[PDB]
Amino acid sequence: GESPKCGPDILVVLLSVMGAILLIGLAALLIWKLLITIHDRKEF
Amino acid sequence: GALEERCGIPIWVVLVGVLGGLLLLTILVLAMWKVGFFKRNRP
């Protein structure tokens, strides 16, 4: 086997979790901007 | 039968994973802000 090596397998999960964090943050960022644009257009 | 745990994920790794993502997220914000992405092209 010489493959129980939880390098690749941990690595897949460490990367997968990291990707998840990166993708939501980007989502959050866009959502924040979207609300700001709307509040700014919304002539009060 | 439970000899699994081939690669049970230690909290450190999830902890390292979370930290890396936040660091990448902090870089992303700074670069875009510096680029004026968040600023208006208000003419």
Swiss-Prot record, chain A:
PTM (free text): Phosphorylated on tyrosine residues in response to thrombin-induced platelet aggregation. Probably involved in outside-in signaling.
Resulting phenotype, residue 40 to H: In BDPLT24; the mutant protein is constitutively active; spontaneous FAK phosphosphorylation; abnormal cell shape
Transmembrane segments: 10-32
Annotated tissue distribution: Isoform beta-3A and isoform beta-3C are widely expressed. Isoform beta-3A is specifically expressed in osteoblast cells; isoform beta-3C is specifically expressed in prostate and testis.
Localisation per UniProt entry: Cell membrane; Cell projection, Lamellipodium membrane; Cell junction, Focal adhesion; Postsynaptic cell membrane
Function statement: Integrin alpha-V/beta-3 (ITGAV:ITGB3) is a receptor for cytotactin, fibronectin, laminin, matrix metalloproteinase-2, osteopontin, osteomodulin, prothrombin, thrombospondin, vitronectin and von Willebrand factor. Integrin alpha-IIb/beta-3 (ITGA2B:ITGB3) is a receptor for fibronectin, fibrinogen, plasminogen, prothrombin, thrombospondin and vitronectin. Integrins alpha-IIb/beta-3 and alpha-V/beta-3 recognize the sequence R-G-D in a wide array of ligands. Integrin alpha-IIb/beta-3 recognizes the sequence H-H-L-G-G-G-A-K-Q-A-G-D-V in fibrinogen gamma chain. (Microbial infection) Integrin ITGAV:ITGB3 acts as a receptor for Herpes virus 8/HHV-8.
Free-text note on domains in this protein's UniProt record: The VWFA domain (or beta I domain) contains three cation-binding sites: the ligand-associated metal ion-binding site (LIMBS or SyMBS), the metal ion-dependent adhesion site (MIDAS), and the adjacent MIDAS site (ADMIDAS). This domain is also part of the ligand-binding site.
Extra information: The constitutive activation of ITGAV:ITGB3 on neoplastic cells may contribute to tumor growth and metastatic potential.
Disease tied to this protein: Glanzmann thrombasthenia 2: A form of Glanzmann thrombasthenia, a disorder characterized by failure of platelet aggregation, absent or diminished clot retraction, and mucocutaneous bleeding of mild-to-moderate severity. Glanzmann thrombasthenia has been classified into clinical types I and II. In type I, platelets show absence of glycoprotein IIb-IIIa complexes at their surface and lack fibrinogen and clot retraction capability. Bleeding disorder, platelet-type, 24: An autosomal dominant disorder of platelet production characterized by congenital macrothrombocytopenia and platelet anisocytosis. Affected individuals may have no or only mildly increased bleeding tendency.
Family: Belongs to the integrin beta chain family.
The protein's name: Integrin beta-3
Full-protein positions shown: 709 to 753 of 788
From Swiss-Prot, chain B:
Positions of transmembrane segments: 8-33
Ranges in coiled-coil conformation: none
Motif GFFKR motif, chain ranges: 36-40
Protein name as it appears in the record: Integrin alpha-IIb light chain, form 2
Species this chain originates from: Homo sapiens (Human)
Part of the intact protein present: 989 to 1029 of 1039
